[PDB]
């Protein structure tokens, strides 16, 4: 589990969104595994606006932050799970690292701020849903 709290927005994995998130919905995209809801309190996270390919992510199943090198956001085939059929997930970045069920939502960050959140795992790989192109998260 986990979310990004920027401005008056809460960014979560779409597959982990709560009823309150759907009742206060700002934007959602199944192909990216992302959903954004509105919040009453202002958040403290800042979004990175860059092309970094190195950063650090939080792995809840290890209670540890790991430095990683990651691919550029791309269209990647993800195997069937209990949340989605086998499909192409867009704006996904892969790295070598531990990610098991429960780790979705952990933040990936670089020197500029938050880059994205854990969205996929298994096989010694971790995949992150990028948020750096969502410029509107910085306003309103
Ligand atoms: C932390 O990821 C959890 C999981 C995963 O990759 N899933 C399951 C959750 C949805 C993910 C997706 N974005 O399509 C795919 C569990 C299934 C296999 C090991 O990793
Ligand atoms: Zn950066």
UniProtKB/Swiss-Prot annotation:
Residues annotated as the enzyme's active site: 15, 33, 104
* Reaction equation(s) it catalyzes: Selective cleavage of Tyr-|-Gly bond in the picornavirus polyprotein
Residues binding Zn(2+) 1: 50, 52, 110, 112
Task performed by this protein: Cysteine protease that cleaves viral polyprotein and specific host proteins. It is responsible for the autocatalytic cleavage between the P1 and P2 regions, which is the first cleavage occurring in the polyprotein. Also cleaves the host translation initiation factor EIF4G1, in order to shut down the capped cellular mRNA translation. Inhibits the host nucleus-cytoplasm protein and RNA trafficking by cleaving host members of the nuclear pores. Counteracts stress granule formation probably by antagonizing its assembly or promoting its dissassembly.
The record's subunit annotation is: Homodimer.
**Protein name as it appears in the record:** Protease 2A
Report which part of the complete sequence is shown: 869 to 1008 of 2193
């Amino acid at each position: 589990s986990g979310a990004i709290y920027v401005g008056n927005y809460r960014v979560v994995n779409r597959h982990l969104a709560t009823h309150n998130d759907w009742a206060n919905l700002v934007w959602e995209d199944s192909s990216r595994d992302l959903l954004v809801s509105s919040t009453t309190a202002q958040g403290c996270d800042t979004i990175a606006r860059c092309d970094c390919q190195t950063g650090v992510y939080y792995c809840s199943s290890r209670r540890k932050h790991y430095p990683v090198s990651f691919s550029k956001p791309s269209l990647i085939f993800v195997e069937a799970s209990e949340y989605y059929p086998a499909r192409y997930q867009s704006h996904l970045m892969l790295a070598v690292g531990h990610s098991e069920p429960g780790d979705c939502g952990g933040i990936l960050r670089c020197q500029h701020g938050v880059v994205g959140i854990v969205s996929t795992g298994g096989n010694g790989l971790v995949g992150f849903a990028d948020v750096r192109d969502l410029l509107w998260l910085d306003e309103e």
